[PDB]
Structures are given as C-alpha cells and as structure tokens.
Amino acid sequence: NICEITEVDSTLVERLGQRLLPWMDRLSQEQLNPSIYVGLRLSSLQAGAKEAHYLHSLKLSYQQSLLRPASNKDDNDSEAKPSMGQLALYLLALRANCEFIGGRKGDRLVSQLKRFLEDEKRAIGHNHQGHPRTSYYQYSLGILALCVHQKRVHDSVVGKLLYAVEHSVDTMAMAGMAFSCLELSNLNPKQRNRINLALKRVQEKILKAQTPEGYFGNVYSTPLALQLLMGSLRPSVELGTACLKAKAALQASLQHKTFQNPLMISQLLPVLNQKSYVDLISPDCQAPRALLEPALETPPQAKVPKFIDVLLKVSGISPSYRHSVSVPAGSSLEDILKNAQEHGRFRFRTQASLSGPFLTSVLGRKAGEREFWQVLRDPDTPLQQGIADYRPKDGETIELRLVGW
Numbered sequence: 001n002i003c004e005i006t007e008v009d010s011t012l013v014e015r016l017g018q019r020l021l022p023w024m025d026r027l028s029q030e031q032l033n034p035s036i037y038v039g040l041r042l043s044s045l046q047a048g049a050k051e052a053h054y055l056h057s058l059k060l061s062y063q064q065s066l067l068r069p070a071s072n073k074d075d076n077d078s079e080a081k082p083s084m085g086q087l088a089l090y091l092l093a094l095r096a097n098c099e100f101i102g103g104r105k106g107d108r109l110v111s112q113l114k115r116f117l118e119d120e121k122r123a124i125g126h127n128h129q130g131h132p133r134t135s136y137y138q139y140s141l142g143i144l145a146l147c148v149h150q151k152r153v154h155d156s157v158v159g160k161l162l163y164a165v166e167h168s169v170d171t172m173a174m175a176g177m178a179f180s181c182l183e184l185s186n187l188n189p190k191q192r193n194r195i196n197l198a199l200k201r202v203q204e205k206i207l208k209a210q211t212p213e214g215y216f217g218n219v220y221s222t223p224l225a226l227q228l229l230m231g232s233l234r235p236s237v238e239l240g241t242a243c244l245k246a247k248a249a250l251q252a253s254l255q256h257k258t259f260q261n262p263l264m265i266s267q268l269l270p271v272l273n274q275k276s277y278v279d280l281i282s283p284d285c286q287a288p289r290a291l292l293e294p295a296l297e298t299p300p301q302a303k304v305p306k307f308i309d310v311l312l313k314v315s316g317i318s319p320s321y322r323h324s325v326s327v328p329a330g331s332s333l334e335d336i337l338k339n340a341q342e343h344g345r346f347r348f349r350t351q352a353s354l355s356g357p358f359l360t361s362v363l364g365r366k367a368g369e370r371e372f373w374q375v376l377r378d379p380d381t382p383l384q385q386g387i388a389d390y391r392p393k394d395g396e397t398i399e400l401r402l403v404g405w
C-alpha cells in the first residue's frame with residue numbers, strides 16, 4: 001500500500017517508544033491512559049509486561065469508577081470518573097488485548113456508551129441546528145469503539161455522523177475509521193451505500209486539507225489521517241501523491257523531536273507499524289514486538305543554561321493581564337504559568353486529560369459551554385502543542401485567549 005510507512009529508522013521509533021515507557025508506572029486514576037496502551041499494542045514495541053498490569057489497572061479503575069451504586073452516599077460527586085470518550089478508548093484497549101467486552105459489567109459499560117451517543121444525537125438535533133455536547137471526534141470514536149466489539153448502534157445515531165460529513169482532519173480521520181469499520185462489519189446494512197459515499201467524502205476533505213509542507217491539517221493530524229488513508233479501497237493518483245508527500249513530511253519532523261506528547265506518540269506508533277484503529281476489528285496478539293528497556297541515563301550538563309525572556313498575556317476577559325518572566329530555555333509554557341502564579345498576580349486551573357493538563361481557567365475565569373482558553377504565539381498563531389509540551393522560544397509573547405467556538 002502506497003499510503004503506508006514502509007521505511008522507518010528503528011532508533012527513531014525506539015526513542016518515541018522510550019517516551020511512553022515512564023507512563024507505564026503511572027497508574028493513578030488521572031494518569032491512566034487507554035490511548036497509550038492501544039498505541040503500544042499496535043506498535044512494533046513492547047513496554048515490558050508492565051503492559052498487562054497497565055491494562056489490569058485500566059480494568060479495575062474504569063469498572064469501579066463507572067459502575068458505582070445507584071446513588072452515592074451523600075456527595076453527588078466524590079472522585080470524578082472517566083468520560084464516555086475515554087470509555088470508548090478503554091474499549092479500544094480491550095480489543096488491543098484481543099478481548100471482547102463481556103459479562104454483566106461489560107453490558108453496563110456498552111449501555112453507558114450507547115446512552116452517550118443517544119444523548120449526543122439529541123443534542124445535535126432534528127436537522128442539525130445544534131452541536132454535540134462533546135464533539136464529532138468523540139461521537140465517531142464511540143461508534144468505532146462499539147463497532148470493533150461487534151456492537152451495533154442505532155441507524156439514527158450513525159445517521160447524525162453521516163449527515164455531518166455529507167453536508168478538522170483529526171475528526172475526518174476518526175469519522176472515517178468509524179465508517180470504515182461499519183462497512184467491514186456490515187453492522188448497518190440499511191445504510192451500506194450511504195456509508196461508502198461518506199468515506200469517499202472523508203478521503204476528499206483530508207486531501208484538500210493538505211498543506212504546502214505535506215501534512216494533512218498539521219503534523220499532529222497527519223498520523224490519524226494516515227491511519228484512515230492506509231485503509232485504501234479507493235487507490236488514486238492524487239491519493240498516492242498526497243500520501244507520499246505526507247509521509248516525507250512526517251519522517252522529517254521525526255528527526256527534529258516534534259512528537260513529545262504521550263497521546264500523540266500513541267497515535268503515531270501504530271502508523272509507523274502499518275496499523276490503525278480499524279485493525280482492532282481482528283487484532284493480531286501473536287506478533288512479536290521489540291522490548292523497550294529503561295532509557296535510564298538522561299545526559300547531565302553542569303553548564304549554566306540559556307535563559308529566555310518571555311511575555312505572558314491574557315485576553316478575551318476584562319481586565320487583560322500581562323506578565324514578564326525569564327526562565328531557563330526548554331521550560332514549558334506550564335512551567336511559566338506556575339512561575340507567574342508563584343511569583344505574581346497570575347492564577348490558572350487545568351484539568352486532567354489523556355493529552356495531559358488542559359487549561360480550563362485563567363485568572364478566575366473558567367471557560368464555559370462553547371468556550372476554551374486558546375493558546376497563541378504573537379501574532380495570532382495558535383500553538384500546536386498544549387501548555388505542558390510547548391517550550392517557548394526567546395522573545396516570544398504567549399497569549400491565553402478566551403475564544404468562542
């Protein structure tokens with residue numbers, strides 16, 4: 001297949017996998033990450049049988065959190081649980097261990113997932129003058145998660161996805177893989193053709209989204225795009241050119257330490273191993289992988305570093321706020337935030353996610369329903385990394401902007 005990463009440097013892949021390894025010891029409820037597990041299982045690498053314990057931890061945690069009694073004893077909260085999108089990833093995790101969800105606990109979780117989709121269907125509405133409470137990405141992911149377990153969703157639920165496609169890249173890829181799975185599973189035969197046409201659309205929109213550099217959307221959307229596109233069934237001259245161009249671009253960024261985010265790597269590794277989430281229909285748990293070993297040697301400087309002077313600014317709220325910080329080069333945006341909070345009038349709140357700390361509130365102003373704290377480098381360039389991974393450059397002005405999407 002022309003859209004497959006045929007050639008990759010084994011030491012690059014091993015470095016990437018090396019970045020996920022420490023996470024296999026991070027088993028608290030907020031650190032646990034079904035996406036990392038799936039990434040590794042679909043990869044050419046293995047993280048010890050640290051893996052089995054990880055999955056087992058996922059099972060105990062996702063069950064005890066999501067299956068808690070009819071009403072909790074006088075709290076209405078105590079210990080915030082995984083979301084439904086995360087449940088969908090947990091289901092992908094099970095398949096990656098060649099397990100089908102089952103038992104009474106299994107049924108209850110499948111139900112929770114289906115209820116989620118049903119509720120998103122209702123939020124979207126009638127004839128689509130309305131948004132999903134979460135997003136089309138999780139909508140698609142839910143469908144794909146149930147599909148790989150041979151679980152059928154309502155024709156009306158799939159309809160909502162089809163319609164949204166029929167009338168960015170990351171969402172397209174994920175919607176695509178859901179459709180791709182529905183087709184190969186024949187779980188909604190009553191819309192067999194409608195789905196086939198939706199795939200062609202998805203392929204079209206992704207190629208249209210290709211940048212001068214070769215990425216589909218951006219470097220980080222590229223692996224998911226490739227996950228869907230290696231699924232072929234529409235081999236094309238335009239598609240071959242696009243895929244070759246996309247691949248060169250991806251391999252180039254790999255030489256430059258572009259992927260640092262654990263979730264990103266977990267989406268990349270399957271691709272560098274010619275696998276996608278659609279392979280979870282029938283996973284191959286017999287294939288051997290290369291054992292990753294503790295890196296265990298992070299090089300010591302004993303030098304005085306460079307410092308960077310960076311300007312922090314906050315907009316989209318009254319009043320606006322600015323802050324001057326000089327910190328050691330290589331410091332993350334999150335470090336700069338904690339610094340400003342520690343040594344000044346700044347304050348912020350993040351909440352946990354599978355991509356790490358998601359900035360939810362700045363200066364006591366929390367983003368509401370269709371708002372979010374956008375992060376940009378001046379002038380007006382939205383960052384492509386979150387606070388924990390983005391390491392600002394010298395001279396930069398970094399903007400936390402409350403936006404209405």
Ligand code: B12
Nearest residue numbers: 085086170221353354355358359372374375382383384386
């Ligand atoms: C939906 C989405 C959003 C929504 C989320 C709200 C919503 N409606 O649910 C919005 C628009 C707010 C958003 C914002 C951002 N996003 Co976004 N987002 C996505 C998308 C398409 C799906 C994530 C998802 O639902 N995952 C599924 C569920 C199961 O996982 P989850 O961990 O529970 O998802 C939560 C987090 O993903 C959080 N979230 C969304 N984006 C990001 C980005 C980061 C860095 C973090 C830590 C969290 C986060 O929202 C979800 C919960 O509401 C992904 C695509 C992808 N390829 O993964 C990108 C993606 C994760 N986002 C990305 C980016 C860059 C951002 C921003 C930094 C953009 C910016 N410059 O301001 C911000 C985050 C800033 C902040 N406040 O901390 C990148 C991350 C790349 C990287 N190297 O880490 C991705 C991969 C897209 C891309 N190709 O660039 N995003």
Ligand SMILES: [C-]#N
Nearest residue numbers: 168170382384
């Ligand atoms: C996120 N986009």
Ligand SMILES: [Cl-]
Nearest residue numbers: 108109111112
């Ligand atoms: Cl239930």
Ligand SMILES: [Cl-]
Nearest residue numbers: 259260261389
């Ligand atoms: Cl990254």
Ligand SMILES: [Cl-]
Nearest residue numbers: 348361363364
């Ligand atoms: Cl705050």
